[PDB]
């Protein structure tokens, strides 16, 4: 199998495979498999008081498969950099899940003595360490 996309902001995985046929070669078979993981316990925006549970999930194929990173092409005798999509609007996407390799913090005001301080919390405590 060949991995087409593996998206972590919405936790989607797409693979595909060609199975030929040596009997009248228009009965060829092309197969595509999609794997979706739906969370049921986290908010709409990722900040704590927010619309207590997301209950509607929307998956558009063209939004999952996009390649938002440049590339290098050799045209005649030079190498040029090129973009790979039309939809790379300049980051304001709503993610459905957390990412295991990224940080997510929050800011809370607390009181210590006759003052008020503004401290920072951690929502995924494994992934935020100063090293």
């Amino acid at each position: 199998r060949i991995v087409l996309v593996d998206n972590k902001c919405k936790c989607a995985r797409i693979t595909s495979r060609i199975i030929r046929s040596s009997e009248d070669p228009n009965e060829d078979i092309v197969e595509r498999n999609i794997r979706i993981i739906v969370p049921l316990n986290n908010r709409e925006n990722i900040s704590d008081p927010t619309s207590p549970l997301r209950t509607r999930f929307v998956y558009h194929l063209s939004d999952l498969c996009k390649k938002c990173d440049p590339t290098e092409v050799e045209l005649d005798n030079q190498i040029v950099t090129a973009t790979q999509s039309n939809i790379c609007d300049e980051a304001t996407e709503t993610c459905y899940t957390y990412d295991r390799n990224k940080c997510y913090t929050a800011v809370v005001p607390l009181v210590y003595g006759g003052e008020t301080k503004m401290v920072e919390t951690a929502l995924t405590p494994d992934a935020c360490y100063p090293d």
């Binding site: 087409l4 996309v5 797409i14 595509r32 999609i34 979706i36 739906v38 049921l40 316990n41 704590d48 008081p49 207590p52 549970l53 209950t55 509607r56 999930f57 929307v58 998956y59 558009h60 194929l61 063209s62 999952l64 498969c65 390649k67 913090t105 929050a106 809370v108 005001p109 607390l110 009181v111 210590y112 003595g113 301080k117 401290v119 920072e120 919390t121 951690a122 929502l123 405590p125 935020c128 360490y129 100063p130």
Partner: protein, 230 residues
């Protein structure tokens, strides 16, 4: 009585919410006056203060001393020593302490109200449990929405160690009573726990009236399926 000397670690509310992490050295059971003299091993800008005497158990003088500016040597892991000397002595005492090792990170659980309290429709009770952390010190705070509640509105017990299934760990609880109008309307509540082994010194968890599932509805659409993935 018999004179003793010990060293106390700086308090956790200052290491996480302030700047001045005062470390202190004490003394108990002196007899007649205070001619006591002190020193430490580091003296990097150490403006040491001795202060006045006091009265200990049954009545006995007891003078301590404090060393300002001890945050970065503590978190870096240096070691401190304290020796005193009373005028009826030919042997200075000693004490040492350091920031501990072999630590563990607490597990925080926030529990929904029981089912019998929601029917009587007066007040409901939320519970916060922290479990499995090796040094005994911890902080617990609550939030309603985004505003912090005052400390005179909830009750939190002390930190005791739990039965052994390996290494030795500790645990703590707290409860909060809130009105059933504010709970059945859709407000959210959060519990924040602070500890040394946590990464950014604080972590939190949150709950509301929907969490705990009932028969919830979910909808998935999956709009275009065969659509040239590129």
């Amino acid at each position: 009585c018999h004179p003793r000397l010990s060293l106390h670690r700086p308090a956790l509310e200052d290491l996480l919410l302030g700047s001045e992490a005062n470390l202190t050295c004490t003394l108990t059971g002196l007899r007649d006056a205070s001619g006591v003299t002190f020193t430490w091993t580091p003296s990097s800008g150490k403006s040491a203060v001795q202060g006045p005497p006091e009265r200990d158990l049954c009545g006995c003088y007891s003078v301590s001393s404090v060393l300002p500016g001890c945050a970065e040597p503590w978190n870096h892991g240096k070691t401190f020593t304290c020796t005193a000397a009373y005028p009826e002595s030919k042997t200075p005492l000693t004490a040492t302490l350091s920031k501990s090792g072999n630590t563990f990170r607490p597990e925080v659980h926030l529990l929904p109200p029981p089912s019998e309290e929601l029917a009587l429709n007066e007040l409901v009770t939320l519970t916060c449990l922290a479990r499995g952390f090796s040094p005994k010190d911890v902080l617990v705070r609550w939030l309603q929405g985004s505003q912090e509640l005052p400390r005179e509105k909830y009750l939190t017990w002390a930190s005791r160690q739990e039965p052994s299934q390996g290494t030795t760990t500790f645990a703590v609880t707290s409860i909060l009573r809130v009105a059933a109008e504010d709970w059945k309307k859709g407000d959210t509540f959060s519990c924040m726990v602070g500890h040394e082994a946590l990464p950014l010194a604080f972590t939190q968890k949150t709950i509301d009236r929907l969490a705990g599932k009932t028969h919830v509805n979910v909808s998935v659409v999956m709009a275009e399926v065969d659509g040239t993935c590129y």
